[PDB]
Amino acid sequence: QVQLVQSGAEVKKPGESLRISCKGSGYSFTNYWISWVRQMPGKGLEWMGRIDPSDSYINYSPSFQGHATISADKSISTAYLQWGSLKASDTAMYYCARGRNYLDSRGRFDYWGQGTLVTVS
Amino acid sequence: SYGFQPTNGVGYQPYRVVVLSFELATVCGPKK
Amino acid sequence: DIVMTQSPSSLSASVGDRVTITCQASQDISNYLNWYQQKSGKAPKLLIYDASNLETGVPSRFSGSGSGTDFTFTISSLQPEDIATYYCQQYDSLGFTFGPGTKVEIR
Amino acid sequence: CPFGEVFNATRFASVYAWNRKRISNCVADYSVLYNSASFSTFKCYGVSPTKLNDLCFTNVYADSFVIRGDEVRQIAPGQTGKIADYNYKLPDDFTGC
């Protein structure tokens, strides 16, 4: 009876900071990779990267510019993504999923959430 | 002490680890 | 600096024949391949990922197989609404690169 | 570079007898390394993968061995464990990949 529910759509004015959350439960959160997927509306997906809460190692997509950083909190076992200055490119919807376990080699993102839409206007 | 079996869990599989060390000319980038 | 091409671009065959399209990258991509369906008034959306995980409610008509440099596509049941643009899709744990794509239309 | 016989060798030496081979007088394609991620783990400290192509390095060192999955955590700066303490200690300011 494990269910994962993401936050709802958020619309914020330019120049404001927005933080989105994705919560995992019923398992060791730090023992499973959390995968993030971005998609511009009207276009395809752009896979940006996934972060292990064990060491907070951050891997960037080849089109990265260093504007956005990923941080995770081990006290509450909840994944977070923060934007210090929202811009036009931040307008998209994001998917958070449980990636392949660090022990397994065959990649998989087991479960699909409903997604979280971020709009900057 | 190391358990390597075909019927073991996927977690106990061996991993190849290669570490590149730099210590402070012949090898460079793939040309330009 | 990177110049890749897809051939053949257009194929002609009788009814019931098998049509296979192949797209290659600069290096081996193992089995990192997905299939996207693009509608005229809708955006492409990933339905089956890794070709081994099926989301609830996703039709089974989409499938993928093959690894290395040779790939084969099999149609369980051809449908009139199956016309779309198929994109060769390679990806890794660092990022993703869009291929040029090949536009194929069936009358 | 003679990386085909090193990375794709049928058998690797033991961890206590890890084989180190000097590599020189060749061109290394790092674009394969950073443009593709068939390798599950890619941890670089002190260097940027982007500047690898635009920089020239001398006296390249490569250590290869075989270990288990759960010990990847212990090989990290500011970390404790049985291996890092009683088997082999790495510098905190280690630079490499």
Q: Would you list the DSSP string of chain A?
A: ---------EEE-TT--EEEEEE--SS-GGGEEEEEEEE-TTS-EEEEEEEBTTTTB----TT--S--EEEEETTTTEEEEEESS--GGG-EEEEEEEEEETT--S---------EEEEE-
Q: Which residues of C59-96 are buried (b: 16+ CB within 10 A; e: fewer)?
A: eeeeebeeeeeebeeeeeeeeeeeebebbbbbbbbbbb
Chain C: list its partners (3+ Cβ pairs within 8 Å).
Answer: A, D
A88 touches chain B (CB under 8 A): no
Which residue's structure tokens are 């180190």? D20
Domain C4-107, architecture per CATH: Sandwich (2.60)
C50 touches chain A (CB under 8 A): yes
- CB within 8 Å of C79: residues ≥ 6 apart: C61
Tokens of C91: 């990806």
D-chain CB neighbours of C29 within 8 Å are 36
Tokens of A34: 């959390």
CA B32 – CA C39 distance, rounded (Å)? 41
CA A82 – CA A86 distance, rounded (Å)? 9
- Domain boundaries, position A17: 10-120
Report the SS3 class of residue C71: strand
CA D95 – CA D44 distance, rounded (Å)? 8
D66 touches chain B (CB under 8 A): yes
Report the SS3 class of residue D96: strand
CA A5 – CA A25 distance, rounded (Å)? 10
Nearest CA in chain C to D35: C94
The alpha carbon of D82 is separated from its chain's Cα centroid by a whole number of angstroms, namely 21
Residue A71 lies in a domain: yes
CA D8 – CA D73 distance, rounded (Å)? 25
C94 with D32: Cβ contact below 8 A? no
Tokens of C31: 């089995």
Q: Which of C36, C55, C96 sits opposite A46 (nearest CB)?
A: C96
Residue A3 lies in a domain: no
D-chain CB neighbours of A66 within 8 Å are none
CA C6 – CA C23 distance, rounded (Å)? 6
Report the SS3 class of residue D51: helix
Upper half-sphere CA count for residue C107 (Cβ side, 13 Å):
5
- State the best of A33, A36, A43, A45 to mutate against chain C, taking most chain C CBs within 10 Å: A45
Residue A1 lies in a domain: no
Closest CA–CA distance from residue A111 to any residue of chain D (Å)? 21
Helix or strand (DSSP H, E) at D33: helix D30-35
Q: Specify burial of residue A44 (Cβ count, 10 A radius: 0-12, 13-18, 19+).
A: middle
**Total number of domains constituting chain A:** 1
Closest CA–CA distance from residue D60 to any residue of chain A (Å)? 24
Cis status of the peptide bond prior to C8, with omega within 30 of 0: yes
Method used experimentally:
cryo-EM
Nearest CA in chain B to D41: B17
Long-range pairs of C78-82 with CB within 8 A, sequence gap ≥ 24: C82/C106
Chain A: list its partners (3+ Cβ pairs within 8 Å).
Answer: B, C, D
Contact of A79 with A68, CB cutoff 8 Å? no
β-strand partners of B18: D64
CA C3 – CA C107 distance, rounded (Å)? 31
The candidate with the shortest Cα–Cα distance to C23, out of C95, C92, C89, C107, is C89
Cβ contacts below 8 Å, chain A against chain C, sum to: 40
Nearest CA in chain D to C93: D37
- CB within 8 Å of D24: residues ≥ 6 apart: B26, B27, D60
CATH code, A66: 2.60.40.10
Residue A102 lies in a domain: yes
Catalogue the E-assigned strands of chain D: 61-68
The candidate with the shortest Cα–Cα distance to A62, out of D1, C2, C43, C72, is C2
Helix or strand (DSSP H, E) at D84: helix D82-86
